[PDB]
From Swiss-Prot, chain A:
The atypical PHD-type zinc finger recognizes and binds histone H3 trimethylated on 'Lys-4' (H3K4me3). The chain holds residues 1 to 351 of 527 of the full protein. Changing residue 197 to N: Does not affect the endonuclease activity of the RAG complex. Changing residue 275 to Q: Does not affect the endonuclease activity of the RAG complex. GO terms for cellular component: nucleoplasm; nucleus. The lineage of its organism: Eukaryota, Metazoa, Chordata, Craniata, Vertebrata. It comes from Mus musculus. This is V(D)J recombination-activating protein 2.
Curated annotation (Swiss-Prot), chain B:
This is V(D)J recombination-activating protein 1. Autoubiquitinated in the presence of CDC34/UBCH3. It comes from Mus musculus. Homodimer. Component of the RAG complex composed of core components RAG1 and RAG2, and associated component HMGB1 or HMGB2. Interacts with DCAF1, leading to recruitment of the CUL4A-RBX1-DDB1-DCAF1/VPRBP complex to ubiquitinate proteins and limit error-prone repair during V(D)J recombination. It is found in: Nucleus. The RING-type zinc finger mediates the E3 ubiquitin-protein ligase activity. The NBD (nonamer binding) DNA-binding domain mediates the specific binding to the nonamer RSS motif by forming a tightly interwoven homodimer that binds and synapses 2 nonamer elements, with each NBD making contact with both DNA molecules. Each RSS is composed of well-conserved heptamer (consensus 5'-CACAGTG-3') and nonamer (consensus 5'-ACAAAAACC-3') sequences separated by a spacer of either 12 bp or 23 bp. Disruption phenotype: Mice display a severe combined immunodeficiency phenotype. The have a small lymphoid organs that do not contain mature B and T-lymphocytes. The arrest of B- and T-cell differentiation occurs at an early stage and correlates with the inability to perform V(D)J recombination. The frequency of homologous immunoglobulin pairing is much lower. No obvious neuroanatomical or behavioral abnormalities have been observed. Belongs to the RAG1 family. Signal peptide: none annotated. The chain holds residues 663 to 851 of 1040 of the full protein.
Length: 346, 189, 95
């Protein structure tokens, strides 16, 4: 509940909706710039530091064997904390294609506070999921092993039903649950009858043996359901086993942003309530060993713009710090392209 | 320059164009049906648009030619002996080389290896030169060499940027005096 | 000549009124003779049929965004675009 306005550098224009903020050891990094990578920064990933509410998008370099990657506009990202690394799946390259690669991003070396990433390309073998965006991925541990759960999002029509009067129409992918092994690149689908409708832009929390799926949009009936789901996974020495459950007391949100304010307690901020109604309230969720609860916190102060605008976007910075953006008026005294804001909860 | 919107609109047209390159259109032409087969050449692009959608570095690069692969420090020594070796599929596989990075080397020599290709090209275009913007560019270039030769730089170089506005003024004043050519900022054809 | 569709009516009605016999046709028989020259009027067929392209023969002006979804949850768009299909443009441009 601490809002602040942020001044920007000169290359403000490299922020589009759907970036990703990779957080390494307190340092914050920007991914998903607008347009293909220029010659000011040939990699397309930015060092993103903010001092005195003034931020500086500095370049970053790669390793000797890294895989130079396209700027994805809506991927799924997860924090695989086993060295620390990030996992990027899917997304939407600026030629409006969709990718189906796994990008593994870690730090090679950091000298003189100047980082040097590396990123490798892992391609799944087996029951590979179809390329999509807006989905979610989460790494979960059990019995000394780790698997990446993946719940699907929306995508294009398959390559036989695409007509070029409706070439750019999207439909939700089939609501299975994919399980991914990273060390060998394996995939496994799981069909389960408790998940019926397609879901996109939902929120996914991962507490140490189970993943909670909350909110989301469903394109089959253009409704935003309120029902959350709990997914329990265990991999034995044999084949892994997945279970779902519908728990009561959820909420209806889509494209919300959720971060970790304390140990085992998360907070979620404004996505969208209805197709015209933004969500100004915020909700704190309290985790546990087996039980959670969702309560509403004290609905913080908004400025004239964030009360008055039509859309927003943003993500979290890592230390409980939400980055947000606002379009801003065009019919004005030549107002800027975007306004930016920082929310703190400490 | 809004690259995502431009690809979002021009993608179905390239889908239809790539469809109708292996087909025959049968259609009546005055009674009896006739059969048509098409050959597409995409040529009418200016230098900025042909540099963007074919996936090159921008026009102020170290790499100048959309048709060949020589730097501008290689042009001024061998002026006329070049060839034409920038196709479309070659640029597509060079982007694939840039994305994969299979030889495990840094950006400063990977960019030299792929000859400045740093995006995915998405329109099949043929390499050619224009005719309009070429003539306007040559016009402005030796107009600038006229303004240079007034100030006699071959005797002594590097006068500062206060002689030059006087050189411009004496040039267009003299040429308006003789030819009645009004001084125009944006040069036309 | 870049007349409007309301000034043509002026010229037509007073030419017909002054010289009695009409020389310019009315607006409706003009628009009925417009539909021959646009795309989306003639039968045609491809051999082999086109992959990913519809097989109908009678579509004229489509939305150029190609069903690109504009919901608040997705990437924002505000452009307007129109287009023909490519094949049905070449058919009328040949005939
Ligand atoms: Zn050349």
């Amino acid at each position: 509940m601490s809002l602040q306005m942020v001044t920007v550098g000169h290359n403000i224009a490299l922020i589009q909706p759907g970036f990703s903020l990779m957080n390494f050891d307190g340092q914050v990094f920007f991914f998903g710039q607008k347009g293909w990578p220029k010659r000011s920064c040939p990699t397309g990933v930015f060092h993103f530091d903010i001092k005195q509410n003034h931020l500086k998008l500095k370049p970053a370099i790669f390793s000797k064997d890294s895989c130079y990657l396209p700027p994805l506009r809506y991927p799924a990202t997860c924090s695989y904390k086993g060295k620390h690394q990030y996992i990027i799946h899917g997304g939407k390259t600026p030629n409006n294609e969709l990718s189906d690669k796994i990008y593994i991003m870690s730090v090679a070396c950091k000298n003189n506070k100047k980082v040097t990433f590396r990123c490798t390309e892992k391609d799944l073998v087996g029951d590979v999921p179809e390329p999509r965006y807006g989905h979610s991925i989460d790494v979960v541990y059990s019995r000394g092993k780790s698997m990446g759960v993946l719940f699907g999002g929306r995508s294009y029509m398959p390559s036989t039903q695409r007509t070029t009067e409706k070439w750019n129409s999207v439909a939700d992918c089939l609501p299975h649950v994919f399980l991914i092994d990273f060390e060998f690149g394996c995939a496994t689908s799981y069909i389960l009858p408790e998940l019926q409708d397609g879901l996109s832009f939902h929120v996914s929390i991962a507490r140490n043996d189970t993943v909670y799926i909350l909110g989301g949009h469903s394109l089959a009936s253009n409704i935003r359901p309120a029902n959350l789901y709990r997914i329990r996974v265990d991999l034995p020495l044999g084949t892994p086993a997945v279970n779902c459950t519908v728990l009561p007391g959820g909420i209806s949100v889509s494209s919300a942003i959720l971060t970790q304010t304390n140990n085992d307690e998360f907070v979620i901020v404004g996505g969208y309530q209805l197709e015209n109604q933004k969500r100004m309230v915020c909700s704190l969720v309290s985790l546990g060993d087996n039980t959670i609860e969702i309560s509403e916190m004290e609905t913080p102060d908004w400025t004239s713009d964030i009360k008055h605008s039509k859309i927003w976007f943003g993500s979290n910075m890592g230390n409980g710090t939400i980055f947000l953006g606002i379009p801003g008026d065009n019919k004005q005294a030549m107002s800027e392209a975007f306004y930016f804001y920082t929310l703190r909860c400490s | 320059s809004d690259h995502e919107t431009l690809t979002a609109i021009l993608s179905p047209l390239i889908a239809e164009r790539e469809a109708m390159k292996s087909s025959e259109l049968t259609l009546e032409m005055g009674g009896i049906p006739r059969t048509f087969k098409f050959i597409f050449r995409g040529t009418g692009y200016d230098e900025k648009l042909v540099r963007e959608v074919e996936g090159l570095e921008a026009s102020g690069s170290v790499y100048i030619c959309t048709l060949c692969d020589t730097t501008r420090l290689e042009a001024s020594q061998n002026l006329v002996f070049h060839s034409i070796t920038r196709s479309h599929a070659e640029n597509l596989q060079r982007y694939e080389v840039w994305r994969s990075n299979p030889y495990h080397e840094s950006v400063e020599e990977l960019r030299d290896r792929v000859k400045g290709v740093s995006a995915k090209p998405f329109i099949e275009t043929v390499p050619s030169i224009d005719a309009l913007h070429c003539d306007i560019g040559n016009a402005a270039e030796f107009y600038k060499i006229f303004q240079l030769e007034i100030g006699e730089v071959y005797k002594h170089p590097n006068a500062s940027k206060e002689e030059r506005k006087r050189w411009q003024a004496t040039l267009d004043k003299h040429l308006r005096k003789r030819m009645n050519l009004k001084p125009i900022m944006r040069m036309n054809g | 000549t870049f007349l409007s569709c309301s000034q043509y009516h002026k010229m037509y009605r007073t030419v017909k009124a002054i010289t009695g016999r009409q020389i310019f046709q009315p607006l409706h028989a003009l628009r009925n003779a417009e539909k021959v020259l646009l795309p989306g009027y003639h039968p045609f067929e491809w051999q082999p049929p086109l992959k990913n392209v519809s097989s109908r023969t009678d579509v004229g002006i489509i939305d150029g965004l190609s069903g690109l979804a504009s919901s608040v949850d997705e990437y924002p768009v505000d452009t307007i675009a129109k287009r023909f299909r490519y094949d049905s443009a070449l058919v009328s441009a040949l005939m």
